[PDB]
Amino acid sequence: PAYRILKPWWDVFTDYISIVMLMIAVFGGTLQVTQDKMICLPCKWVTKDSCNDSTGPTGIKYDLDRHQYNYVDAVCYENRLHWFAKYFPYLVLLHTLIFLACSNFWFKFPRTSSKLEHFVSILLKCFDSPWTTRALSDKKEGEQAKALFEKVKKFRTHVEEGDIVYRLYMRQTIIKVIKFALIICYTVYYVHNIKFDVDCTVDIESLTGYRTYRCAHPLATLFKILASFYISLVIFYGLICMYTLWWMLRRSLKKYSFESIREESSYSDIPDVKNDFAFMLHLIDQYDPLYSKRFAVFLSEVSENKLRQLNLN
Amino acid sequence: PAYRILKPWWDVFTDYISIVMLMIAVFGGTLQVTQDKMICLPCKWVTKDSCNDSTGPTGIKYDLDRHQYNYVDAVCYENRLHWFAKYFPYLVLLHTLIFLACSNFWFKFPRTSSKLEHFVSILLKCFDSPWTTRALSDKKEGEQAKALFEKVKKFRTHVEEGDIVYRLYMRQTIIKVIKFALIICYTVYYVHNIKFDVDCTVDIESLTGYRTYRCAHPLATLFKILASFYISLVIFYGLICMYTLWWMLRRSLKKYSFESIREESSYSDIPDVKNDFAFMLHLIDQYDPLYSKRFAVFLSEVSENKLRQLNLN
Amino acid sequence: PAYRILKPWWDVFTDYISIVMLMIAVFGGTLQVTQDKMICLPCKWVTKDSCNDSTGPTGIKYDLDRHQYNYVDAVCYENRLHWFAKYFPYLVLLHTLIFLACSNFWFKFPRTSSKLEHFVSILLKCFDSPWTTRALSDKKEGEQAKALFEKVKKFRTHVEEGDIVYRLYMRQTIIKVIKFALIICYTVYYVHNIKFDVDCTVDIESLTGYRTYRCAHPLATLFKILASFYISLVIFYGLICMYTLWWMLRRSLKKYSFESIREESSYSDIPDVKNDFAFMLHLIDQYDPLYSKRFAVFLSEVSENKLRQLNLN
Amino acid sequence: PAYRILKPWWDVFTDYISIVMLMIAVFGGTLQVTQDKMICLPCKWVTKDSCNDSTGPTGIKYDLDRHQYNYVDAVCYENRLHWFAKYFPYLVLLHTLIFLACSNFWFKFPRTSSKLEHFVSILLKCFDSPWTTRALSDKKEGEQAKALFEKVKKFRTHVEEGDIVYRLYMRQTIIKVIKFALIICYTVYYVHNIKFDVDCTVDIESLTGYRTYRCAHPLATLFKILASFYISLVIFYGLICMYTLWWMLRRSLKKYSFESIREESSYSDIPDVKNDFAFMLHLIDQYDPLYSKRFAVFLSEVSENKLRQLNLN
Amino acid sequence: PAYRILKPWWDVFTDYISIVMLMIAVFGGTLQVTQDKMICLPCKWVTKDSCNDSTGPTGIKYDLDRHQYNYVDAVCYENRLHWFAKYFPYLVLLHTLIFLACSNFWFKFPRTSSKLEHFVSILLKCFDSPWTTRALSDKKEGEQAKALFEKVKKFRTHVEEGDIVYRLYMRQTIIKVIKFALIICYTVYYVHNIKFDVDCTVDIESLTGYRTYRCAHPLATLFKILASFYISLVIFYGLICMYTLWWMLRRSLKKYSFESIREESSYSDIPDVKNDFAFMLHLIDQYDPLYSKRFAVFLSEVSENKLRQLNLN
Amino acid sequence: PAYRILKPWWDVFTDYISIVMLMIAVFGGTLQVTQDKMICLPCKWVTKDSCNDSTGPTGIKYDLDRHQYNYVDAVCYENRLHWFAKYFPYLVLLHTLIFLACSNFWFKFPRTSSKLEHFVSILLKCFDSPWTTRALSDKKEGEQAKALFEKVKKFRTHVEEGDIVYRLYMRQTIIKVIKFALIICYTVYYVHNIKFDVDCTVDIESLTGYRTYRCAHPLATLFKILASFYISLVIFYGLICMYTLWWMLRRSLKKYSFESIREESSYSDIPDVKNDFAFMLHLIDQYDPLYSKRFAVFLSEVSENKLRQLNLN
Structure with missing residues (x-):
């Protein structure tokens, strides 16, 4: 539907x-599944269970075939690599879905979506009404107009009772803000963990004859870029949701003050809202104040009285 | 069509x-078909048909080429690996389709879909009727209105006879609940079975010269994650279908009590439902009580009488 | 178009x-083309042209390079493998298309599709007619109504002549039933043929130096699953087409008995069908009896007479 | 547009x-580009420049590395393989496009497409006209009706002049029939050429040290299946276009005989067609005779006279 | 929009x-990026820096591993291969886009697109006007008709001033013709350059120990086919644009002669065009002369006078 | 919506x-992720830590297996390769998105998008108004016309207040111009950096036994082509945004001069704009002056007076 109105710029x-x-979560994942591999090499002179680093030059030989070279790469990858380096793209994707689910839940929950x-x-219809064009300053339009005055009155009573909508939007952004804080708590705490050069001591010498091996993760750099990029991205996310929340707190959105509009329209008979109908009004005011202005006329009883006199006549 | 009304939040x-x-069933399957491979290595000093695990260090040599290394990987994969580890993504996908088929069958079965x-x-039309706007508190609208009073009366008689719709929705959720119980019965019972390190004793020594081999399944970890993730997912599924079922049992949905609405509308002439028409009413009430409220007027005979007097006049 | 009415639940x-x-035909084929490979290994001590199966252990050497290892895999795959194991996904796909072509041919054949x-x-239009709403228990509607009475009479004469439609639907399901019987005749007769472990004796010793080789088909298992799954699938297919056929035979669909409806409508002047117009009526009755009920009124001559009196008046 | 009418069952x-x-042209091509490879092996004892085919057994050694093994595979593939085996999927695709271009050219050529x-x-409009419903056995409809009588008369004169449309449809099918004959002339003449086992004598001994090599095309079988399948397919194609052509020749479609319809309609004043307007009539008659029947009324001058009397009145 | 009228058959x-x-540009490119590889082999006995080509036979050994075999393939590919062989699919694609941009620029340029x-x-509207149906041989239609007579007169004056549209279409095809000539100038001049067998002398003997190497481009054949196919394709392209250009030159499209139509319509008061409005008329005449014929009536002043008399009456 | 009007040719x-x-950013990236590999070879006689370049010829041997050959390729790729060569396609893509975001932000920002x-x-509506057709040289149209005169007057007052729209379009293009200058500042400054032949000195001799290695980047050429192509592309981009900016500066778009139109229309009562409503007028004037011309009539008070006299009459 025409829910573009329903999303302020912060949304x-x-x-x-x-x-x-x-797009980075999928791009990192489809990349990860593709290779996410390592190149583990032994170390002959070991000290501390670490590579001791002890005519023309010639190649060194460890006397090993391809598969046990592939085998050792799996194990050092399996055990001596951080879960964070391996499941990074699959993780932010999960988080990416929540921030979506924590918006459309509002639109999709039926008790409110109605x-x-x-x-x-x-x-x-109120925006499109011809009669407001007169009243903002024929008879068939009056029947249509008064027909709308009634359901407006019933709508005014039907929805002003509840307060669930404001509660959801509150309950929605508050967790996303809370969610943002945790992503920064741990993600920076382990972004240092990934790195190209790594050494593994895995205790398989009955099978190879070596104990310790130095590997090299080729993708440790790029994943570091996405993380620093992603974190910088989500920081800008975290400020957006912070701002609108303060705005939801500072402004006291349960009620709306018509008192500025009623000066211009010169309508002394126009009531204020109580709950759950000023919030949605407070929202669409953020899109523009126009639609709220056209709505003052269908709410005022003397405006109906003006129609009722013209309709009787 | 506009079947969004037909699905409560639990649906x-x-x-x-x-x-x-x-998405995980396909993502695991497309991953499985891609490699789902192992790296099987022999064990020279064997005890119990198990790897006995008995200057500088040097590589061990089993004196084997690439293909018989590939051959042995197939066999230990073929026979000394669990079917559950191999067919996991192809299994939940099957289950994923049933839960879909066990919803749209309701919408798609013709005896009900009509x-x-x-x-x-x-x-x-009843929601959109102009005349209810008057009656909830012109002549052409009365013909349209009374035209609807009749088919409503025929619809009231045509569908209240059967009880198949309530039976299907009952027969539908009850099996999905039953289905959920089995998935947890066996899936946890074999999730322990998958694991990275494995050893196979396969009796091929005329071809290689070794009997027992230690392999390594690189994907045993990730598939463990999807299972624990999937199981946690389906637990939340299993509670949803449990709740609505109890609600279908506690509430006795064959009949609906209009008696609350008739106080507000002040209509003493309004009948209750018997079977298969209150259930669908009980449903749409879950979406909102509004549509049920607008429907009280087209059902009351005095409401028709009010129209009939205004139509005669 | 709105051909959803035209397909009963068995369709x-x-x-x-x-x-x-x-989906399994394509999934098996795209898998087959991907590898569909084997790992053929020789056998030194052969008996019967079969593998005779005759300090620490060490690898056996056949002294062979990669390509002739690839060569031998092709030949044993080429000749000592069953066509059924190789062309399975390409086969049911063919059969899958026939069952589609043997439904839409009915809709697509022009002599009937008109x-x-x-x-x-x-x-x-008959379902949507306002006038039947009166007659089932204004003047402009009468012209529209009588306009439809005429083409109905011409349609009643135009299509009741032929009998091709009933012949096609008969000729259609009968071959699909016949088709189903053959799929079970041969497919089970060769599903045993596929298997992981296989041995080939191919007579190439000028090129390798060995005669007999033991291979291993890694996909023999999975293709066995799809076949047992597919066969179980098509069994349920074969019963559907069997049921509707018996229903087409038991019920004698060339003619339809209006005699039950005419009791309720209280219309003694209403004719029965002869051929090719009760069958299509028998069909839509399966969707629902409603549309047939609304159609009794436009067919009865006294119903036209009732209109004709009201139209004259 | 609604050009489904324009295509008989043979179209x-x-x-x-x-x-x-x-689908087979693309499926073979995407397969061909994927590998379309061979496995060329030398032959030590050669006779006729052919493989002479002259304790336990052991592997033969030609003392060759991977690349020159890859090199030789290219050359025997390059030169000692038939162009037909390699370009088969790219060939029928070309032919597949012509049969499409040799249908939509008719619809797309502007001098006719108008x-x-x-x-x-x-x-x-003639099919939808209310007035024919009367005449086949109000005043505003008469203006609309007579408005159509005029453009019909102008259309009758405007298009009956030319004869290009019948010429195109003739020129179209005749080449497709001619085209079909050639595909069978050469394709069967070279389907024997493809085969799994092949031997190449390529004269490169300064680089390998061997002259003659035996290769093996793994896809020679499958491509043989598609060809025999494709040929069987196109045979059924070739008969379709043959039938409609004979029908275009036997029936003399430049003119149409109204003389059967005019008996039933009882209209002695109705003219026959001359050229290029009976052909298109002959076509739509193939879809159904109905539309032609409704068209007799707008063509008869006395039918206009009947309207003209009712319009004057 | 309905710009199908705007494109003659040559467009x-x-x-x-x-x-x-x-489709060949992308199909060659996606193929090129896939492998576009070579198999470079040394030559022991070299003469002229060319391969001198100087019991049972045995394999030759150059004593080289896989990577430097891969290394040498890159260099001979890098330097001793023609740019034309490598960038062919990426080149015609570029050219393919221009011929598209050099058509839609006309439609997309705003000063004309209006x-x-x-x-x-x-x-x-002129084609759909009811009143022309009378005039080609009511009062509300006259207001609509005369309403169109005015904007036609303003349109006649508004657009006949400029001449940019004819200039663009001229400037458009003339460069595409010019463009076509160059593609044939160089492409044939280098299609000979590609070829399967190639020899490279690259001066790397500190790394391999050999100087000259014979390579083999497996795709040189297929790319030769696409080029000869593409060139034959673009020749047919080049004639199309040549023909319409001559037609644009021979026919003097700035002005249009109404003088043939005015005989049939019997309208002596009808003016000819001057510039930029006969060209677009000359175009749509190519689609059909019908729309131009219906347009003579709204242009003639006496035709307006005929309406003006009927409108006054 | 119909925002095609909103984009001049420079947009x-x-x-x-x-x-x-x-398309090149994605085409380079999908290519980069595919291989982006190197072939690093050692150098036995080294001088300066550079390759000293010091019967029949024979292959050189470094005595190294495949993996450490793969290992060394990673490191020289990891460290002795420029970030610019590796992240080029991922970089312009980023820039490609900004130029999109720095256009649709204008359309998407809500305070303006309204x-x-x-x-x-x-x-x-003003373009489609029938009454302007008269006034540019009935009563129901006058109500519609005057209805539009009012909202025009309110729109004239509502939007002429702000100046944000002109500020955004200014703030938008100015950064894209600024952005363009930087891309040329650094990209040319490092395009020289990429190159096929490269040498790396990486200090791993405990693992291989060699220090310095010569590698070869096969894609250095093609990426050089895209950069020179991309830069040439973006130069043409940079001139477009430069031109419209000067046009935004030279022309003083806050106000619009109606004074040319009012001569032709002969309307002395027509006001000029002040701010934010002439800019959008200045824009659509660029599409065409027509829509601005039709808009003079609904703005002139005497034009309303002309209607008001005709409406009173």
């Missing part, structure tokens, strides 16, 4: 930051 | 839990 | 059974 | 036979 | 010739 | 230059 960047976050689809449905 | 999470369940497509078709 | 499961049948597109086109 | 099977023809888009456009 | 074949041109979208927009 | 080439820029969607919405 729209958030939409696309939650897309390139996916309220949303109702709130929008009336506002287009 | 909507169920829809998407039955999507990522697919009833559903009829039940929805009338309710939009 | 709808048949539609989707003829989809997963495809009749179908005509039969449906009138029935929507 | 519709032809459409889909020209699809699976593509005539087609005109012929169809009028016939829907 | 429509040109559209599809510029599609298969793409004129085109205006010229088409009026012509549909 | 349309910019759209497609920002597409092929993507203004844009409003500005367009009124202009279609």
